[PDB]
C-alpha cells in the first residue's frame, strides 16, 4: 500500500458505485498489507546484505485484518459513508468479467476479484523485514497520506489520530 | 428542419468565435509592430484548430477545496446562455420571433453573470472570490444605465420587437437621432462583456486569472468561447439597434451581408479599444456609471419621452 497503490486507492474508488460489494461481507478474508517504503528499503538492504544471496523473503506488515474491518477503516479515514453489502461470488466474478472488456486499464478484473478475497498466507519459515533490519510500518501510521486525497473539502484538515484504528486479528 | 436551423445558427457562431481569437491576436500584433500568428497554417488560419485540440486533449483538474456541482455547472451555463443569446436576432429573419426580444436578451444577460459568480465561489480560491465580487460590482455599476438606455432608444421604435428596428431605420440610422445614448450604450456594452478597459473580473495583471484561475483545459475553453460569443452578439445587437441596414424582402442576402460587415466593424472597434487603453479601477467604473452616465441617461430618457409627443412623431403598434 502506498500513494500510487491499487490497494487503498482501489477500495477508496468503490464509493462511486454507492455500496461496497464484498464476498461474504469480507468476513472470511484476512489481509496483511505492507508499506511501499518498507519493501523498497528491504530490497535495498537485500542488495547490501551478503547472506541474502540465495534466500527467499516474505515482506508483510505488522498486523492482520479481516477484509470487512480493513475496508471499514479505509472508508472511515477517507470520511466516506460505508455501505457494505454481500454479493455472491459468481455475480461479482461476472462484474469483473464485464469490467475486463476495457481496452484501457481495467477498473477491475476477475483475477482482481479472486486476489482481493483470498486470505494472505502465513509463512513463518521464511525470513522477513526484521531479518533485514526493517521494522514494519503499521497501516495506521501511513493510511492518511494515501486517503486524505479521497476526502471532500470539509474533512481535509482532520488529523491522523482521529479515526480509531481498526481491530486486528493477531493470532 | 427546425433543428437544422438551430445547428446552422450555433455551429457557424462557434467557428466565428474560433477565428475571432486569431483576428484579435493578429490585429493586436500589428498595432504593436509585430505580426501575430502566421506559422500554424497560412497566415495562421490553422491556429484556432490547434488551440482547441490542445485545450480539449489536456487534463482537467478538480480543485480539492472546490464545490464540484457548481464548478461543473458554471461553464455549462455560460456557454449555453452565450449560444441562446443569438436566437432572437433578426438577420433579417430571427430563428425565434418574439414580441419582446430586447427584454428577453436583457434577462438572459442578467442571468449570465451567475456563471462567473458561481465559478468564482465554487473554485474556493481567494483570487476567484475577488473576481466574483468584482463581477457583482460591475453588474451593479452598469445594469440600470444599460436598461434605461435601451428604454430611451426603443421609445422611437414603438415596441420591443427586434425585427421592427429594421422598419424604424428604413431611411436613416437611429444613431443620427441618439448618438449620445449610442456612446453611453457602447461603453455600457464594453463594461457588460468584461472587456478592456473594464476587464476587471479576470484582472490578469492584478488577480492573475481572477474568476477562472482554477479552471483548466476544456472547461476553460468554454468560458473563453462564451466570452467571445457574447462579444460578437453584443456587437451584432448594437449594429441592429443603431445602424439600420436596408432590407429588401425579395433579397435578404444583401441585408445579411450589410449586417455582417457592420458587426465585424464593431468587433474590430472593441479590439482596437483593447489595444489602446489602460485598465480602470473597479470603483472608478462604478463612479463613472453612477455619477456621469446615470444623470445624462435620466435626462435623455426624459427628453426621449417628451420628443415624440412634442413633434407628433409617436411610432405605431401599441
Amino acid at each position: 500500500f502506498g500513494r500510487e497503490d491499487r490497494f487503498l486507492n482501489y477500495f477508496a474508488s468503490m464509493r462511486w458505485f454507492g455500496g461496497v460489494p464484498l464476498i461474504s461481507l469480507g468476513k472470511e478474508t484476512v489481509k496483511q498489507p505492507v508499506y511501499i517504503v518498507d519493501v523498497s528499503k528491504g530490497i535495498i538492504n537485500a542488495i547490501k546484505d551478503p547472506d541474502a544471496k540465495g534466500k527467499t523473503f516474505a515482506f508483510v506488515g505488522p498486523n492482520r485484518y479481516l477484509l470487512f474491518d480493513l475496508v471499514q477503516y479505509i472508508f472511515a479515514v477517507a470520511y466516506r459513508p460505508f455501505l457494505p453489502y454481500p454479493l455472491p461470488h459468481f455475480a461479482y466474478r461476472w462484474v469483473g468479467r464485464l469490467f475486463e472488456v476495457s481496452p484501457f486499464e481495467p477498473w477491475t478484473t476477475r483475477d482482481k476479484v479472486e486476489r482481493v478475497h483470498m486470505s494472505d498466507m502465513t509463512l513463518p519459515h521464511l525470513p522477513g523485514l526484521e531479518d533485514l533490519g526493517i521494522q514494519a510500518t503499521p497501516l495506521e501510521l501511513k493510511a492518511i497520506e494515501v486517503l486524505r486525497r479521497h476526502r471532500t473539502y470539509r474533512w481535509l484538515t482532520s488529523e491522523m489520530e482521529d479515526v480509531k484504528p481498526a481491530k486486528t486479528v493477531n493470532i | 428542419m427546425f433543428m437544422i436551423n438551430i445547428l446552422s445558427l450555433i455551429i457557424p457562431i462557434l467557428l466565428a468565435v474560433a477565428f475571432l481569437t486569431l483576428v484579435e491576436r493578429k490585429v493586436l500584433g500589428y498595432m504593436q509592430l509585430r505580426k501575430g500568428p502566421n506559422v500554424v497554417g497560412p497566415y495562421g488560419l490553422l491556429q484556432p484548430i490547434a488551440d482547441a485540440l490542445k485545450l480539449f486533449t489536456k487534463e482537467p483538474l478538480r480543485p480539492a477545496t472546490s464545490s464540484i456541482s457548481m464548478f461543473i455547472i458554471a461553464p455549462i451555463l455560460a456557454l449555453s446562455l452565450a449560444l441562446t443569446m443569438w436566437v432572437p436576432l433578426p438577420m433579417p429573419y430571427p430563428l425565434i420571433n418574439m414580441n419582446l426580444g430586447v427584454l428577453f436578451m436583457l434577462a438572459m444577460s442578467s442571468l449570465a453573470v451567475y456563471s462567473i459568480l458561481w465559478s468564482g465561489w465554487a473554485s474556493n480560491s481567494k483570487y476567484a472570490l475577488i473576481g466574483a465580487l468584482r463581477a457583482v460590482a460591475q453588474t451593479i455599476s452598469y445594469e440600470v444605465t444599460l436598461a434605461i438606455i435601451l428604454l430611451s432608444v426603443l421609445l422611437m421604435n414603438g415596441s420591443y420587437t427586434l425585427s421592427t428596428l429594421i422598419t424604424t431605420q428604413e431611411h436613416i440610422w437611429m444613431i443620427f437621432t441618439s448618438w449620445p445614448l449610442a456612446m453611453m450604450w457602447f461603453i455600457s456594452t464594453l463594461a457588460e462583456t468584461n472587456r478592456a478597459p473594464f476587464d476587471l473580473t479576470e484582472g490578469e495583471s492584478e488577480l492573475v486569472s481572477g474568476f477562472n484561475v482554477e479552471y483548466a483545459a476544456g472547461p476553460f475553453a468554454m468560458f473563453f468561447m462564451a466570452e467571445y460569443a457574447n462579444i460578437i452578439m453584443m456587437n451584432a445587437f448594437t449594429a441592429i439597434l443603431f445602424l439600420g441596414a436596408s432590407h429588401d424582402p425579395h433579397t435578404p442576402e444583401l441585408y445579411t451581408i450589410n449586417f455582417v460587415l457592420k458587426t465585424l466593424a464593431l468587433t474590430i472597434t472593441f479590439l482596437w479599444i483593447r489595444a489602446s487603453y489602460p485598465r480602470f479601477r473597479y470603483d472608478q467604473l462604478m463612479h463613472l456609471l453612477w455619477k456621469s452616465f446615470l444623470p445624462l441617461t435620466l435626462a435623455l430618457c426624459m427628453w426621449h419621452i417628451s420628443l415624440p409627443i412634442m413633434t407628433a412623431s409617436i411610432p405605431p403598434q401599441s
Binding site: - | 490585429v27 500584433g29 509592430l33 456612446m183 482596437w272 479599444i273
Partner: protein, 176 residues
C-alpha cells in the same frame, strides 16, 4: 539647473472652458490614442522570419567555446592554466603532463557550460589565442550532461568552426 513637470495652470476664459467641456463630453484624447494605434497598425512590423532570417551580430560576439590549432594542426594550448585561474565561475578544469615528444600539453580540459557565464575573460587571458568564444549560440541540449564539455568536444568545436573563428579574429585583433 532644473525644470518643473506639472506646474502649468489652465486658462479660465470661456473659450478654454468650453474646449475642456467638449473634451470631457466627446472624448478627444481617447480618439487621439486610438489614432496613434491605428497609425501603428498600417506600419511595417519589425518581425524577422526566424530561423530563415537572423539577428545581426558582431565579430566580438561571445558564443560556444572552442579550442584552436596552429596552421600545422598543432594544438595552440600549452596548459599554462591562465584561463582556469581567471575564470570567475571556476568552470574550467585542466590537467597536464609532458607529451610523448616532451611537449607541454593538456590531458584534461573541461568547461562546465552550466557553470559558465560567457564573460570572455578566458579568451582574454589566453596568451596564444587557444581558447575562444565562438559565434555559435544554437547549441541547446536535451540532457544536462551534454553541456559538460571535455577536451575532445572543444577540439571538435574548433575544427568545425575555425573557418568563421579565424575570420572573426582577423576583424577584431587590432582592437585587442
Amino acid at each position: 539647473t532644473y525644470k518643473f513637470v506639472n506646474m502649468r495652470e489652465p486658462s479660465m476664459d470661456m473659450k478654454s472652458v468650453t474646449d475642456r467641456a467638449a473634451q470631457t463630453l466627446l472624448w478627444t484624447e481617447l480618439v487621439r490614442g486610438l489614432g496613434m494605434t491605428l497609425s501603428y497598425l498600417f506600419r511595417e512590423p519589425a518581425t524577422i522570419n526566424y530561423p530563415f532570417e537572423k539577428g545581426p551580430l558582431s565579430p566580438r560576439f561571445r558564443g560556444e567555446h572552442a579550442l584552436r590549432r596552429y596552421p600545422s594542426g598543432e594544438e595552440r594550448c600549452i596548459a599554462c592554466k591562465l584561463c582556469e585561474a581567471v575564470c570567475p565561475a571556476q568552470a574550467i578544469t585542466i590537467e597536464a603532463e609532458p607529451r610523448a615528444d616532451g611537449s607541454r600539453r593538456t590531458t584534461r580540459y573541461d568547461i562546465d557550460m552550466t557553470k559558465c557565464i560567457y564573460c570572455g575573460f578566458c579568451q582574454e587571458a589566453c596568451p596564444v589565442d587557444a581558447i575562444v568564444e565562438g559565434p555559435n549560440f544554437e547549441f541547446s541540449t536535451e540532457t544536462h550532461e551534454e553541456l559538460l564539455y571535455n577536451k575532445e568536444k572543444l577540439l571538435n568545436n574548433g575544427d568545425k568552426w575555425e573557418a568563421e573563428i579565424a575570420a572573426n579574429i582577423q576583424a577584431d585583433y587590432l582592437y585587442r
